[PDB]
Design a binder for this molecule. Structure first.
Ligand SMILES: CCCCc1ccc(S(N)(=O)=O)cc1
Ligand SMILES: [Zn+2]
Length: 257
C-alpha cells in the first residue's frame, strides 16, 4: 500500500522496504561543483531507431510506456556501462506545481518533472533477474522544465485521457522515444537504486544535464491523471516523486569537462 501520501509516502517506505535507508539509494542531489569529470567514461550510445513501443499503462504510481524487449531493438550502451542494456519502459515523475516534480535535483534545484528511460543488462537474461544484480539496470534520467512544447511528447499527452485511472491501459504502438531527448548527451552518473519500492540497489543512473522543455499545457495533462481506480474517490496523480536521499559513500561523475 505504498504511495506518495502523508500516510504511505517516502518517509514510511522503510518499514516494508528497509533498504530505503541503504547505502546507495536514489534519487540524490547532484552538486555540480563536486561532481568530477571522468576521462574513463566511454562515449554514450543511445540507439532507439528500432524501438517497438506496445502499450501505455496507469499503474497507480505513474504511467509507463512499455516496449518489446524480446530482442536488442532499443538499447543503451557506452558511458559508464559495460555491455548492452535494453529499453523496457519509460515513465515520468512530476509535481503539483511547476517548481517541483523531479526526483534528482541539481544544486538543490527541482525541475517540473523527470523522465526515466529504464533499461536492463542483457547479460542477466530477463528484467526480473537483472533487478537482483548490482549492475542490472541503467536508467537514463531527463529533466523537464516548463517552456515551449515538446512535439515528441504530444502523442503521450493525448492518450492520457484514456488511461485516467489505476489499472487502465491503451495501445501505444509506433511511438519513437528519440523525440523525448535533448540535443546534448552530456550527463552525470552514479550508482543508485530504484526510486520506488522495492528500492532495489541495482541501477546505474545516467542523468542528462540538458533539460527538455515541455509546455504548461502538456504537464497540466499529466496532473489530470488519477492515482485511484475507476469508481473510487478522485486523487490527482501529482507529486509522485521521492526526495533526494543521502549520498553516503558515492561520487558523482561528469561526462563533460
Ligand atoms: C521490480 C519492478 C521495478 C519497477 C521500477 C522501475 C523503475 C523505477 S525508477 N523510478 O526508474 O527508479 C522504479 C520502479
Ligand atoms: Zn522513475
Amino acid at each position: 500500500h505504498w504511495g506518495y501520501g502523508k500516510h504511505n509516502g517516502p518517509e514510511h517506505w522503510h518499514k516494508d522496504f528497509p533498504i530505503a535507508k541503504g547505502e546507495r539509494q536514489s534519487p540524490v542531489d547532484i552538486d555540480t561543483h563536486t561532481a568530477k569529470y571522468d576521462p574513463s567514461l566511454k562515449p554514450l550510445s543511445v540507439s532507439y531507431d528500432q524501438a517497438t513501443s506496445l502499450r501505455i499503462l496507469n499503474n497507480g504510481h505513474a504511467f509507463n510506456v512499455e516496449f518489446d524487449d524480446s530482442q536488442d531493438k532499443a538499447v543503451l550502451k557506452g558511458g559508464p556501462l559495460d555491455g548492452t542494456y535494453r529499453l523496457i519502459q519509460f515513465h515520468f515523475h512530476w509535481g503539483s506545481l511547476d517548481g517541483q516534480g523531479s526526483e534528482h535535483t541539481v544544486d538543490k534545484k527541482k525541475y517540473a518533472a523527470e523522465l526515466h528511460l529504464v533499461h536492463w543488462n542483457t547479460k542477466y537474461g530477463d528484467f526480473g533477474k537483472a533487478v537482483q544484480q548490482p549492475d542490472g539496470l541503467a536508467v537514463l534520467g531527463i529533466f523537464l522544465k516548463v517552456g515551449s512544447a515538446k512535439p515528441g511528447l504530444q502523442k503521450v499527452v493525448d492518450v492520457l485521457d484514456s488511461i485516467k485511472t489505476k489499472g487502465k491501459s491503451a495501445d501505444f504502438t509506433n511511438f519513437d522515444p528519440r523525440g523525448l531527448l535533448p540535443e546534448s548527451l552530456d550527463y552525470w552518473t552514479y550508482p543508485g537504486s530504484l526510486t520506488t519500492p522495492p528500492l532495489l540497489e541495482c541501477v546505474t543512473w545516467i542523468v542528462l544535464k540538458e533539460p527538455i522543455s515541455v509546455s504548461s499545457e502538456q504537464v497540466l495533462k499529466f496532473r489530470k491523471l488519477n492515482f485511484n481506480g475507476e469508481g473510487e474517490p478522485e486523487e490527482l496523480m501529482v507529486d509522485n516523486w521521492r526526495p533526494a536521499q543521502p549520498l553516503k559513500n558515492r561520487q558523482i561523475k561528469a561526462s563533460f569537462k
